[PDB]
Ligand binder design. Structure first.
Ligand SMILES: Cc1cc(C)cc(C(=O)N(C)[C@H](Cc2ccc(-c3ccccc3)cc2)C(=O)N[C@@H](Cc2c[nH]c3ccccc23)C(=O)O)c1
Ligand SMILES: CCCCCCCC/C=C\CCCCCCCC(=O)OC[C@H](O)CO
Ligand SMILES: CCCCCCCC/C=C\CCCCCCCC(=O)OC[C@H](O)CO
Ligand SMILES: CCCCCCCC/C=C\CCCCCCCC(=O)OC[C@H](O)CO
Ligand SMILES: CCCCCCCC/C=C\CCCCCCCC(=O)OC[C@H](O)CO
Ligand SMILES: CCCCCCCC/C=C\CCCCCCCC(=O)OC[C@H](O)CO
Ligand SMILES: CCCCCCCC/C=C\CCCCCCCC(=O)OC[C@H](O)CO
Ligand SMILES: CCCCCCCC/C=C\CCCCCCCC(=O)OC[C@H](O)CO
Ligand SMILES: CCCCCCCC/C=C\CCCCCCCC(=O)OC[C@H](O)CO
Length: 410
């Protein structure tokens, strides 16, 4: 049958995945804690939050993974009542540390670019993350216990959190647990990190346009309302509106740059160049713009604007301080994205089972086999997330990649 065939297959798959996560995660997160400790240049707010997150994932890896490997392979629980109050507690405490750290990471990225304006603040965050994650994981250590069954010369030890619990709170917890796990440990971080991501990019966008105009125009705080009025007029002009809509945020700022210098009527005169921008022919747009009277009178500014068009980034206008903040923000929301994709299949599987289990035998069989396969994939991706950040940091962050190579290769 599907259920017995599927569980046997994933006995092999999960054992290899969990052995991979154990080895990769022990090496990766230990090295991650090493490079943040040894490299004094690496000690900053976001990195220290990444360190606690790596310590939390290391705790789950060394405490829970070897047991979870055996648990999957044997029907009996031999590790005692203590280990099975501990393993689910560590599992929810560690994931909670990741969940709250990721939220603190995304809020810190917003505050970094925030218009309103702190080393002690990261220390308060660290305490709050671990205290709150551990408190919210305590009901796991409360509800879970061993059930021993003996019938006809055969005994079995299962550790479970029974749907029926002693106290009112533990009863409510056991019943609400599945939705609680979905809400706080998936919906809460994804919503908060997305909310502060979008606010951050908007604020980073204004800071970049402001910096661009500061370099090109050359002490005016009216730049922001001036920009807003400028895009209003660009949306007013039938010659400038179509190309402006086609452009991304960065190239729209390059168009605004030309509008600041020449006005809307002057920018409209580049009908051929504007068309080619709308066609997304950046290099052709760069060349035709380069052979212009605007280029001739102001080549330095023309060079930067046409490079901004062609490139689509802020390279020509971004200072060292702002290039630092974009790489850090890119690192933070890479980990956020990695968390979402790793925890998406499992939370999807649990919610589909929670919502679509009609208990009719005909519909159940095929839906069960699919949901079971999805659940197994889900817990594999979640295990991978506990070892994925060292690899992710290596690939997405030039600083982390160099720190890893210094610590490991030579
Ligand atoms: C928030 C949350 C939500 C859901 C739906 C499941 C888990 C969970 O707890 N899982 C997915 C573990 C395995 C695991 C735990 C933590 C990480 C982790 C930690 C830090 C950073 C990133 C990832 C990765 C995998 C799991 O296998 N849970 C089992 C229950 C279970 C496994 N071993 C046990 C021992 C005793 C009692 C229960 C268990 C299940 O949900 O099916 C956690
Ligand atoms: C990068 C992370 C990718 C995730 C990698 C680990 C997840 C599971 C992998 C393979 C299982 C494929 C499903 C096989 C289902 C067989 C079902 C069956 O045979 O019944
Ligand atoms: C690196 C950021 C700090 C992350 C950890 C904060 C929470 C520690 C409390 C319980 C953990 C129990 C497991 C033991 C781990 C020991 C961690 C530790 O001793 O760190 C003290 C201090 O940061 C060294 O200078
Ligand atoms: C990954 C998080 C690491 C946290 C490190 C442990 C912190 C324990 C201190 C207070 C909680 C009380 C624990 C409840 C008892 C645990 C289960 C048991 O009884 O063993
Ligand atoms: C940064 C900080 C983030 C912290 C985020 C935490 C949010 C969820 C925490 C607690 C909700 C608890 C809900 C409690 C409902 C229990 C039901 C109940 O109390 O049952 C009655 C019983 O008689 C009484 O003991
Ligand atoms: C489900 C949604 C809420 C889950 C979060 C619970 C943490 C709330 C604070 C947990 C502090 C532990 C208090 C406790 O577990 O009490 C047990 C029971 O009342 C007598 O044994
Ligand atoms: C500072 C604030 C931080 C954020 C704090 C709030 C985060 C989300 C908390 C609770 C929502 C999920 C609670 C789950 C309640 C489920 C109710 C229930 O028992 O439903 C059983 C249902 O019948 C089975 O299908
Ligand atoms: C296996 C995982 C592979 C993952 C590969 C990741 C590569 C991304 C790197 C940099 C782009 C950063 C983009 C950040 C986008 C914002 C993330 C976010 O806010 O997530 C909200 C959540 O999706 C609710 O909708
Ligand atoms: C088995 C392990 C499970 C995890 C598997 C991998 C998880 C995340 C991997 C990649 C995320 C995106 C990395 C690629 C980002 C592309 C942009 C980039 O690399 O730019 C920075 C670079 O240093 C130039 O300066």
């Amino acid at each position: 049958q599907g259920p017995i065939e599927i569980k046997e297959t994933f006995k092999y798959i999960n054992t290899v995945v969990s052995c991979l996560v154990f080895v990769l995660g022990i090496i990766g997160n230990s090295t991650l804690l090493y490079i943040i400790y040894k490299n004094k240049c690496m000690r900053n707010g976001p990195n220290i939050l990444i360190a606690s997150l790596a310590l939390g994932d290391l705790l789950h890896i060394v405490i829970d993974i070897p047991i979870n490997v055996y648990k999957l392979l044997a029907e009996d629980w031999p590790f005692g009542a203590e280990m099975c109050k501990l393993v689910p507690f560590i599992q929810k405490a560690s994931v909670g540390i990741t969940v709250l750290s990721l939220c603190a990471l995304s809020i810190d990225r917003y505050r970094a670019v925030a218009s309103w304006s702190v080393p002690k603040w990261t220390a308060v965050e660290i305490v709050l993350i671990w205290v709150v994650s551990v408190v919210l994981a305590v009901p796991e250590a409360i509800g879970f216990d061993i059930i021993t069954m003996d019938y006809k010369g055969s005994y079995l030890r299962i550790c479970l959190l029974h749907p029926v619990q002693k106290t009112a709170f533990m009863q409510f917890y056991a019943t609400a647990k599945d939705w609680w796990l979905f809400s706080f440990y998936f919906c809460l971080p994804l919503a908060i990190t997305a909310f502060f991501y979008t606010l951050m990019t908007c604020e980073m966008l204004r800071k970049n346009i402001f910096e661009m105009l500061r370099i090109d125009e050359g002490a005016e705080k009216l730049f922001n309302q001036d920009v807003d009025a400028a895009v209003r007029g660009i949306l007013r002009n039938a010659k400038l509106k179509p190309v402006y809509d086609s452009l991304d945020a960065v190239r729209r700022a390059a168009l605004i740059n030309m509008v600041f210098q020449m006005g809307e009527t002057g920018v409209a005169g580049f009908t051929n160049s504007l068309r080619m921008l709308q066609q997304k022919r950046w290099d052709e747009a760069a060349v035709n713009l380069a052979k212009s009277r605007w280029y001739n009178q102001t080549p330095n500014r023309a060079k930067r604007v046409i490079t901004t068009f062609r490139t689509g980034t802020w390279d020509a206008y971004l200072n060292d301080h702002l290039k630092q903040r974009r790489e850090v923000a890119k690192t933070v929301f890479c980990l956020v994205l990695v968390f979402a994709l790793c925890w998406l299949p499992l939370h999807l599987a649990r919610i589909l089972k929670l919502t679509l289990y009609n208990q009719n035998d005909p519909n159940r069989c095929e839906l069960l086999s699919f949901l079971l396969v999805l659940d197994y994939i889900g817990i594999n991706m979640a295990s991978l997330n506990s070892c994925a950040n060292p690899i992710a940091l290596y690939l997405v962050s030039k600083r982390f990649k160099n720190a890893f190579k210094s610590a490991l290769c030579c």
